[PDB]
RNA sequence: GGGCUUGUAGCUCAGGUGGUUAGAGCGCACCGCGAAAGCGGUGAGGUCGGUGGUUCAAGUCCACUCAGGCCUACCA
RNA sequence: GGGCUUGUAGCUCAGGUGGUUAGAGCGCACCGCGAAAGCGGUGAGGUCGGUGGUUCAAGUCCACUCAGGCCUACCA
C-alpha cells in the first residue's frame, strides 16, 4: 500500500536533544523525557525502559515525531513520540549520523 | 498543524543496508544506491553527493521510507528515499543508535 | 544535455555483402493511336545535402558538419 | 491500582476546627379551629454506620473497619 510524497510531508520528523530522563513509578516499561527542539521544549513518554537506562539517554540527539496530537500516558502528557527500530532481538533509538543542531528537520 | 497516529502509520520507515553507491553521470548532486532490506533490495536516488562520497556510505545502515510510489530521476527508477537532516550548515543521514538487522521497522 | 532515423531526377522512391549497379513510376518535350479515361515510341532531366579521410575501387565504410522527423535527461 | 468525599429521628438535613450544642423542616399520633386549601397546641421518634484509642471533656480528634457517591492510573 504505497503513498505519495504528500502523505509523508504531513509528518514532522525532527532531531531533539535529551535534557532529562527518568523512570515512571509503577510502570515496568516507561520513561519520561524532557527534550529540547532548539526553540522549545517537549515532554515525551517512551516505552523503552527495558532496553535503555535513563542515564545513557541524557545528552543524546534522537529523532522524534513532533506534530502528533498529545496523549496522556500514566497521567503524563506526551507531546510527541520517540522513534525506535526493532528486529525481534535488539531495540534501538534513532540518531543523526553526523552532529546537527537540535530542531533540524528531516526530509 | 497536528496529526493523528493513523496519519503516521501510513508511512513505512525501515533500516536499510547500503550495498553499493555511485555518482550519477551528468548530475551535480545525485548518488544512485542499492539497499538491502533483508529479504529484498531497493534502488534509490539521493541528492547528497555534495556531503557524502560513495565510499563512506557503503556498508552503512540508514533510515529510509520504503513505501513511496517510485519516481524516475535521471533515468533511474527510485523506489524510496533516504532521510536526511540539515540545520543550515551540515547535512546528515539517519542511522540506528545500536546495531539492528536490516529491514527493521521503525515505530 | 544524450540518442535514433531520413536526406539520390521536378515529385514519391530503388540501389543486399564497397566493384555487378545510379535506375523505376508519375510528370515534362516531340511523334503516332484513341470517343474519352488512356496507350505505344523516341528523348531530356542527377553538387547521390556539404567537407575531410580510408581503400586498387565509395551513393555504399569512418569522422566532422547542415537540415527535417522522433525518443529521452534537466538534480527525493 | 491511586485518591477525594458522605454516613446523625421514618425522609431531607443543622451541629466551622472538642465543652456553648444532639436539633430543624416535612411526615406520623392525639386534641382543637376552618366551608375548603390549611392552621394552632401537645407528643413519639437517636448503637450520631461498627470497633479500639486520645483527653478533665468526643457526633466532633487519631487508627482500624463496613457501606454509598465521585475523580484518576491500567504501558507511544
Numbering used by the authors:
A (entry chain B), B (entry chain A): 5 to 111
The article reads:
Across all domains of life, a widespread class of OB folds have specialized to recognize and manipulate tRNAs, perform key functions in tRNA trafficking and metabolism, and are designated as the tRNA binding domain (TRBD) superfamily (IPR002547; PF01588). In bacteria, Aquifex aeolicus Trbp111 (tRNA-binding protein, 111 amino acids) and Escherichia coli Trbp exemplify the free-standing, dimeric OB-fold proteins that bind diverse tRNA species. Trbp has been suggested to facilitate the folding of the tRNA structure by binding its characteristic elbow region formed by the intercalation of the D-loop into the T-loop and was observed to enhance aminoacylation by several aminoacyl-tRNA synthetases (aaRSs). Contrary to previous proposals, Trbp111 does not recognize the global tRNA structure nor its elbow or anticodon but solely binds its universal 3′ terminal single-stranded CA dinucleotide with a strong positional, structural, and sequence preference.
To confirm our in-solution finding that Trbp111 binds the tRNA 3′ end and to visualize the interface, we determined its co-crystal structure at 2.6 Å by engineering the tRNA ASL region which does not contribute to binding. We observed two tRNAs bound to a Trbp111 dimer in crystallo employing nearly identical interfaces, each burying ~ 484 Å2 of solvent-accessible surfaces. The structure reveals acute bending of the tRNA terminal dinucleotide (tC75-tA76) away from the tRNA body and its preceding single-stranded nucleotides (tA73, tC74). Comparing the two complexes in the asymmetric unit, the Trbp111-bound tC75-tA76 dinucleotide pivots relative to the tRNA body as a rigid body due to the flexible tA73-tC74 linker. Interestingly, tC75 and tA76 are independently recognized by two pre-formed sequence-selective binding pockets. The immediately preceding tC74 is oriented away from the protein surface so as not to clash with F78. The terminal tA76 is captured by a predominantly hydrophobic pocket, with the nucleobase sandwiched by M85 on one side and the R75 methylene groups and I77 on the other. The tA76 nucleobase is further recognized by hydrogen bonds from S82 and the K73 carbonyl group. Single substitutions of evolutionarily conserved, interfacial Trbp111 residues impaired tRNA binding, with the largest defects from R75A nearly abolishing binding, followed by K33A, S82A, M85A, and F78A.
